[PDB]
Amino acid sequence: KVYNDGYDDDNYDYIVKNGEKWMDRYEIDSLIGKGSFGQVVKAYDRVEQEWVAIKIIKNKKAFLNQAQIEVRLLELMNKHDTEMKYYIVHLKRHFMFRNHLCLVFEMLSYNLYDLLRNTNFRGVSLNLTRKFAQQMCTALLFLATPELSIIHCDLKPENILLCNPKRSAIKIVDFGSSCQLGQRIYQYIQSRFYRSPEVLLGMPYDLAIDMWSLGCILVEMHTGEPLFSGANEVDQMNKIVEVLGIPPAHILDQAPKARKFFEKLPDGTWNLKKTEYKPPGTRKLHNILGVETGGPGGRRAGESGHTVADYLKFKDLILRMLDYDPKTRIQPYYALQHSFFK
Ligand SMILES: CCC(=O)Nc1ccc(C(=O)c2sc(Nc3ccc(N4CCN(C)CC4)cc3OC)nc2N)cc1
Known part of the structure; x- marks a missing residue:
């Protein structure tokens, strides 16, 4: 009682x-x-x-x-x-x-999902999305500090808040599922929508899982909808594949959970198991972002800072954040020197 x-x-x-x-x-x-x-x-x-x-x-x-x-x-x-700690x-x-x-x-003010809910899931501008992308890359650069080496491990719109409702300053929250880099204890990690292919494939992982998450989040801020909205791990991977194509063979050969999603054919190549989805690599990020069609759903047509030039800089930055290989996936330092931030 x-x-x-x-x-x-x-x-x-x-x-x-x-x-x-x-x-x-x-x-x-x-x-x-x-x-x-x-x-x-x-x-x-x-x-x-x-x-x-x-x-x-x-x-x-x-x-x-x-x-x-x-x-x-x-x-x-x-x-x-340092000053870059104030983004946490x-x-x-x-x-x-x-x-x-x-x-x-x-x-603090609201979360970024509440911001997307205020847009009716139509998203915010490429100008505002650049401002969050820079600050999030600055946050991830801070987390990558060698003495820290902190993996947030659960980056999503709910875990990013606005400082003030008027100011455009964002800060990463909730380090409850966070640990420092090291030997692998946990395999089932991150929120599914923002979960990295190395985590889905049962592979080794490090700080790069937060950059994959960021890549997903930044598309969602500008489009309004989640990029890979899987109802399960299989559906998650199929949605990643229909945008980025089949993961490279050298990754899938090492991956312990490769056979959950894919199948090695007699010729040695990898391919999706049967289950709806478009063929691998066909739903281009170019078309999701609307590089030439005036943004997502044609809603940013003739708005300042939404040119073909500005969308290609954003598309390029996102594709580097969404690199399948965590070793060549772009790091916070190089991300901050991307032409999208010039
Ligand atoms: C579901 C788990 C969850 O929300 N965890 C959580 C809870 C609180 C915080 C946290 O540190 C917060 S949350 C916050 N402000 C805040 C953020 C979102 C909201 N919401 C959230 C729900 N929404 C419908 C109304 C606006 C309200 C807030 O307080 C006015 N400031 C801080 N410092 C971080 C994580």
């Missing part, structure tokens, strides 16, 4: 109450989100005199230990002096309150 003296519910979450004052400091206002980790709440900080987003972790060993790993990575990112959400501080670990973040 009673859970944590009545402060928790039946599934270990703290009972969020509007107007409750925590430690004579944090004035709780309203619930923002609830995940598996727990809940996140909007609260006003009285000593700092500013709004904050308090992430309230569940009263559970499994979710507490995971949030401690997140704290360790957030605080390790704060240690570095600032963990201000953490504390224990009535048996719940509470992470205090800076208060």
